[PDB]
Structures are given as C-alpha cells and as structure tokens.
Amino acid sequence: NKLNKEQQNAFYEILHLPNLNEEQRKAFIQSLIDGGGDTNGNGYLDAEESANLLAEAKKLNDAR
Amino acid sequence: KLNKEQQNAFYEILHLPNLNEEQRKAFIQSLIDGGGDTNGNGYLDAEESANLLAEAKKLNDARAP
Amino acid sequence: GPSVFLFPPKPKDTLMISRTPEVTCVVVDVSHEDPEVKFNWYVDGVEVHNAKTKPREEQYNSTYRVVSVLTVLHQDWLNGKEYKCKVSNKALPAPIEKTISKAKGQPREPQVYTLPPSREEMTKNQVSLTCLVKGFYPSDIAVEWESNGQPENNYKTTPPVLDSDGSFFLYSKLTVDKSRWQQGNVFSCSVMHEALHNHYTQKSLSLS
Amino acid sequence: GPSVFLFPPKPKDTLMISRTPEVTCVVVDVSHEDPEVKFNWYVDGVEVHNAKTKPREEQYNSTYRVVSVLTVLHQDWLNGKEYKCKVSNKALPAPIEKTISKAKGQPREPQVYTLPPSREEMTKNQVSLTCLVKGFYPSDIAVEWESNGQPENNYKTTPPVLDSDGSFFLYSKLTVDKSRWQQGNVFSCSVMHEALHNHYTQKSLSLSP
Ligand SMILES: *[C@@H]1O[C@H](CO[C@@H]2O[C@@H](C)[C@@H](O)[C@@H](O)[C@@H]2O)[C@@H](O[C@@H]2O[C@H](CO)[C@@H](O[C@@H]3O[C@H](CO[C@H]4O[C@H](CO)[C@@H](O)[C@H](O)[C@@H]4O[C@@H]4O[C@H](CO)[C@@H](O)[C@H](O)[C@H]4NC(C)=O)[C@@H](O)[C@H](O[C@H]4O[C@H](CO)[C@@H](O)[C@H](O)[C@@H]4O[C@@H]4O[C@H](CO)[C@@H](O)[C@H](O)[C@H]4NC(C)=O)[C@@H]3O)[C@H](O)[C@H]2NC(C)=O)[C@H](O)[C@H]1NC(C)=O
Numbered sequence: 065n066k067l068n069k070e071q072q073n074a075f076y077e078i079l080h081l082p083n084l085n086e087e088q089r090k091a092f093i094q095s096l097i098d099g100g101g102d103t104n105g106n107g108y109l110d111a112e113e114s115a116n117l118l119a120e121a122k123k124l125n126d127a128r
Numbered sequence: 129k130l131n132k133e134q135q136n137a138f139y140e141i142l143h144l145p146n147l148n149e150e151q152r153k154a155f156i157q158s159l160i161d162g163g164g165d166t167n168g169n170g171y172l173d174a175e176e177s178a179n180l181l182a183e184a185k186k187l188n189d190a191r192a193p
Numbered sequence: 194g195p196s197v198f199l200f201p202p203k204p205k206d207t208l209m210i211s212r213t214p215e216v217t218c219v220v221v222d223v224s225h226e227d228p229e230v231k232f233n234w235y236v237d238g239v240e241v242h243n244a245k246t247k248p249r250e251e252q253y254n255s256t257y258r259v260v261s262v263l264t265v266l267h268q269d270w271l272n273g274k275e276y277k278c279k280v281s282n283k284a285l286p287a288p289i290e291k292t293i294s295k296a297k298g299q300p301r302e303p304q305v306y307t308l309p310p311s312r313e314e315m316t317k318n319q320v321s322l323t324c325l326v327k328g329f330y331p332s333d334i335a336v337e338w339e340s341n342g343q344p345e346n347n348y349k350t351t352p353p354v355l356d357s358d359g360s361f362f363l364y365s366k367l368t369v370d371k372s373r374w375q376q377g378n379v380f381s382c383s384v385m386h387e388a389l390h391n392h393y394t395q396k397s398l399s400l401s
Numbered sequence: 402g403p404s405v406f407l408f409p410p411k412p413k414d415t416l417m418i419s420r421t422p423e424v425t426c427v428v429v430d431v432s433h434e435d436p437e438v439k440f441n442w443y444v445d446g447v448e449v450h451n452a453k454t455k456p457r458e459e460q461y462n463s464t465y466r467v468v469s470v471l472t473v474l475h476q477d478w479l480n481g482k483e484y485k486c487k488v489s490n491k492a493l494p495a496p497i498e499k500t501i502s503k504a505k506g507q508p509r510e511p512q513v514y515t516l517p518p519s520r521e522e523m524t525k526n527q528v529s530l531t532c533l534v535k536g537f538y539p540s541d542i543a544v545e546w547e548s549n550g551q552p553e554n555n556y557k558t559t560p561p562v563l564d565s566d567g568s569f570f571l572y573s574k575l576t577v578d579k580s581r582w583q584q585g586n587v588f589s590c591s592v593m594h595e596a597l598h599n600h601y602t603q604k605s606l607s608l609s610p
Pocket residue numbers: 198200201202203217219221222252253254256258
C-alpha cells in the first residue's frame with residue numbers, strides 16, 4: 065500500500081545490528097517515529113532522513 | 129476397506145421420509161447386527177445391502193400418502 | 194470441586210455405519226480423598242445402563258480424571274436426541290448435570306476441490322497437495338487422504354473457519370515426496386459430512 | 402469474582418514500525434459493590450507506569466468491564482520481553498497476575514505459495530484464490546490480499562496449524578467473481594512475519610496457462 069518502505073527497512077536493519085546495546089537500539093528506532101529523524105521537521109520521515117539515520121546506526125555499530 | 133453399499137443403504141434408509149423412526153431404526157440395526165447377513169457369512173454383501181435397501185424402500189413407497 | 198465436560202461423538206463415527214459413535218463424560222479435579230464418581234446417563238430423558246467407566250487416572254497436577262463412555266446410535270444423534278450426564282461425588286454439594294445434542298441449523302453441502310502444488314514449490318524435496326472444503330454447515334466434518342486405497346500419513350487439516358455467508362471452510366494439506374507427485378500417482382481427498390450423499394465424497398488429485 | 406484476560410498485540414503491529422503494538426489487560430465480572438480496580442504492569446519484572454486505564458464500562462448483564470492498555474516497543478516484544486498484568490480488587494482473595502510474551506524458539510522463515518482456483522471451481526460464479534503460508538515459527542503472522550495496490554477484503558484466513566516439523570502453516574482464501582479472475586487481474590498475497598526480510602513479502606497470483 066502506501067507503506068514507507070525506507071522507514072520500515074531502516075527499522076528492520078537497526079533491529080538486527082548485532083553490536084548495538086539496548087539503549088542505542090532504542091534511541092535509533094525511536095527517532096524513526098517521534099520526529100527526531102525528521103530533520104526538516106515537515107511531519108514525514110523522508111527517504112533522505114531514513115537513509116541518514118540508518119547510516120548513523122551502522123556507523124555506531126561498526127565502531128563497536 | 130469401506131463397505132460402500134452398506135454405507136449407502138444406511139444413508140438412503142436414514143432419509144426415507146415416510147418411515148416412522150421405529151421402522152428406520154430397525155432397518156439400520158439390521159445392517160450391523162447380523163439380521164441383514166442372510167447367508168451367515170459375517171459380512172454384509174452387496175446383494176444383502178441392495179435387497180435390504182430395496183425392501184426398506186418398498187415400505188416407504190407403500191406408506192406414501 | 195470436580196468439573197464436568199460432556200463431549201459429542203467424532204463426526205466420522207456418527208456418519209459411517211461401520212463405526213461406533215460415543216458420547217464422553219469427563220470428570221476432572223477429582224480429589225484423592227473422595228475419588229469415587231457415580232455416573233447417570235440419560236438418552237432423551239430415560240436412564241440407560243450401557244455406559245462404561247474407565248479407570249481413574251491421576252494427572253500431572255495431582256488430581257484424578259474419570260471418564261464415562263456411552264455408545265450412541267448413529268440415527269439418534271443425527272436426529273437431535275439429548276444425552277445427559279449426571280456426575281455425583283461427595284466433594285460436590287449436589288450432582289452436576291451436562292446435556293449435549295447435535296448442532297442445529299440448516300445443513301449445507303460442502304464443496305470439495307483439490308489443488309496441485311504451486312509450481313514454485315517443485316524445487317523442494319517435498320510438495321504440498323491441498324484440499325479445499327467450503328460452504329458446509331454444521332462445522333462438524335472429517336477429512337482424510339488416500340492413495341491407491343491406502344491412508345496417507347503426512348497430512349494436516351485446519352479447523353473449520355466461519356466464512357462470510359455463515360458457512361464454514363477449511364483446508365487439508367498433504368505432504369508427499371516430490372518424486373511421488375511427478376510420477377503421476379493419484380491421490381484422493383476424502384470428506385465426510387452429514388449434508389453429503391452417503392455422508393462422504395472423494396475427489397482425485399494427480400499431475401495429468 | 403472478577404476474571405482477568407491478557408491479550409497480546411496484533412502481529413502486524415509489532416512488525417511494522419508505523420503501527421503501535423499494545424498489550425491489553427481486561428477485567429470482567431466487576432461488581433457494582435466493589436468496582437475499584439488497581440492495575441500494576443511489569444516488563445521483565447520491572448514495574449512500568451505508562452499504561453492507560455479506560456473508564457469502566459457497564460455491560461448488559463450489570464457487570465463492569467475495566468480495560469488497561471500498555472503500549473509496547475516493537476523491539477521489546479520481538480526480543481521476547483515478558484509483560485505481566487496484576488489486578489487487585491476487594492472481591493478477589495488475592496490479586497490476579499497474568500503474563501504473556503512472544504513464543505520462544507528459533508524463528509523460521511515462512512514459505513509463501515499462491516494457488517489458482519481448482520478447475521472444477523471454474524464452473525462456479527465465484528472462485529477461490531488460495532495463499533499457502535508454510536514453515537514459519539513463531540505462529541505470530543499476518544496475511545492480507547491486494548490487487549492493484551489496494552486491499553482485497555473478501556478473504557478469510559485460517560488459524561495457524563502446527564505442522565509435523567514443529568513449524569506452522571495456514572491458508573488464506575480470497576473469494577472473487579469469476580469474471581475478475583478471467584480478465585487477467587493480478588492479485589497479491591501479502592505476508593508479515595519476523596523471520597522475513599523487512600518483516601514482509603508478497604506473492605502474485607493471476608490467470609496463467
Ligand atoms: C489438571 O489437569 C487436567 C487435564 O490434564 C491435562 O493434564 C494437564 C496436567 C495438562 O497437561 C493439560 O495440558 C492436559 O490437557 C485438567 O482438565 C482440563 O481442564 C480444562 C478446564 O479446566 C478442560 O478444558 C475444557 O476443554 C474442552 C476441550 O477438551 C478437549 O480438548 C482439549 C484440548 O483443548 C483436550 O485436552 C481434551 O482432552 C478434550 O479432548 C477431546 O476429548 C474428547 C473426549 O475424550 C474427544 O472425544 C475429542 O475428540 C477430543 N478432542 C480433541 C481436539 O482433543 C473445551 O471445549 C472446554 O471449553 C469450554 O469451557 C471453558 C471453561 O473451562 C470455557 O472457557 C470455553 O470458552 C468453553 O466454553 C464452553 O464453551 C462452549 C462454547 O460453545 C459452550 O458451548 C459451553 O457451554 C461452555 N461450557 C462451560 C463454560 O462450562 C474447556 O476448555 C480440559 O478439557 C481438561 N483436560 C482433560 C484432558 O480433561 C484440569 O483442569 C487440571 N486441574 C487443575 C489445573 O487444577
């Protein structure tokens with residue numbers, strides 16, 4: 065349907081990042097649905113914003 | 129192995145509309161308690177199923193208003 | 194205190210004349226101090242005495258389970274006679290009575306369809322043969338699989354599901370080795386239901 | 402005396418991030434004499450306080466129904482955290498405690514197959530489009546139908562059934578008018594399960610040779 069695929073995929077990938085602890089996984093997932101990831105504050109999580117939040121989670125995962 | 133004629137005789141007799149419950153009850157019992165096993169071989173052969181059904185159908189037609 | 198559950202016969206037993214349908218009265222939570230149970234059976238209001246009480250069985254929760262089994266006549270159950278089980282036990286202030294009978298409602302004939310395996314499943318070592326049964330009422334039904342007159346031993350059947358029109362449907366999934374399906378072996382879905390002629394039908398399923 | 406029933410979130414709600422999963426604690430048979438109910442929620446043994454209690458609801462049989470709803474995090478449920486509801490009421494000799502969680506065990510990926518109508522069903526005015534979903538664990542799953550990107554809603558889905566190998570399977574039956582099937586319209590079985598990538602996949606179904 066009108067599913068936000070990039071948001072759903074970022075959620076799934078973040079959910080399975082093995083090196084993140086609980087609080088980090090909790091904070092990244094929460095940013096997908098509470099505005100934190102909505103960098104332009106337009107009320108919708110755009111593909112740019114999903115990709116950028118995912119890249120940040122992968123980067124912290126690789127650094128650990 | 130399923131006895132198709134016995135199963136069919138049971139079904140047909142079960143739905144004969146003009147028989148009373150006691151008659152239909154007596155016919156069904158004869159399918160599994162030897163009464164229908166006319167050649168005492170212990171198994172209800174196709175001949176006996178068809179003949180018992182035909183005999184049961186006969187009473188049903190004779191009772192049609 | 195003890196609790197009572199009264200169960201009807203198995204659909205296959207009431208529909209096939211060669212089988213013996215039974216109503217089962219189960220008494221659970223029977224205590225160790227008062228394990229004696231008395232059963233009184235009634236068929237259409239008259240007491241009967243052909244019931245059999247199975248030996249009590251202690252359960253993993255440290256309570257006894259006592260079962261009474263009463264043979265019933267096929268036509269009596271199909272015509273809606275009521276079977277009453279009355280259970281007496283000194284742990285009960287008064288006997289418990291449970292009554293059951295055949296489900297009421299206009300019978301509706303099941304439609305039986307066989308579906309071959311999805312072509313995408315043909316890459317697996319085992320494939321799924323499907324039997325669709327729909328549009329039947331009541332939900333009491335039995336489904337089996339056969340091949341060359343012999344039973345198949347790896348099938349599962351869903352519970353009856355209420356459809357939009359008030360009738361029921363279900364699926365039966367038969368698992369066979371892919372080689373068996375590709376070789377043209379004929380399989381049969383057997384369905385037993387009161388609204389069917391002879392109370393049963395069979396539908397074949399094969400490759401070509 | 403009051404009874405308590407604890408209900409899990411909908412499988413689709415825990416798997417799709419745009420949705421809100423909730424565990425629901427329902428207290429039934431609450432009397433008019435002792436209608437006060439206290440809820441204590443615990444997640445993995447730690448008490449939480451973000452639950453919302455709905456106003457008591459009188460039923461037709463003159464008993465109250467009290468509901469408490471606790472929002473859960475998708476990852477907490479999917480990772481197997483335990484949710485405990487504790488219900489206190491003066492009509493109870495002691496508070497009642499109910500616990501639920503996602504089923505334990507190694508998850509297994511569903512296999513999704515679409516099956517066209519039986520040739521003998523092609524004589525009926527309506528036909529059955531079938532979706533076989535097999536080999537999945539746990540039984541938490543959601544299955545929907547679609548056509549041209551919009552949902553089809555004249556389908557029924559069986560409950561999950563335990564298979565021989567310990568996994569689960571089910572069937573979803575979509576009923577459509579024969580004409581729609583004969584016209585080559587494409588239908589889609591949509592499946593959502595934790596063991597799928599992105600938690601969802603789809604399989605198409607249309608008139609083929
Ligand atoms: C101590 O243990 C025993 C049993 O040990 C068993 O051992 C323990 C240790 C565990 O391992 C268990 O897993 C194991 O089962 C306990 O006794 C159990 O007690 C519960 C209730 O407390 C009974 O529940 C009832 O179950 C029936 C269905 O029962 C069949 O299906 C069960 C599977 O769920 C199966 O386990 C049973 O053996 C039985 O199996 C059938 O058996 C018959 C006869 O042999 C056979 O012909 C069938 O072919 C066979 N079928 C299958 C599929 O196996 C269920 O129908 C009951 O539901 C009604 O009542 C509920 C109230 O408890 C209510 O919540 C429901 O909504 C439902 O409502 C009734 O609702 C209908 C709806 O239309 C309505 O028409 C009725 O009027 C209404 N009646 C009411 C409300 O009274 C019910 O859930 C178990 O059957 C029973 N198990 C056995 C084996 O006897 C005992 O409780 C333990 N004691 C403790 C813990 O203190």
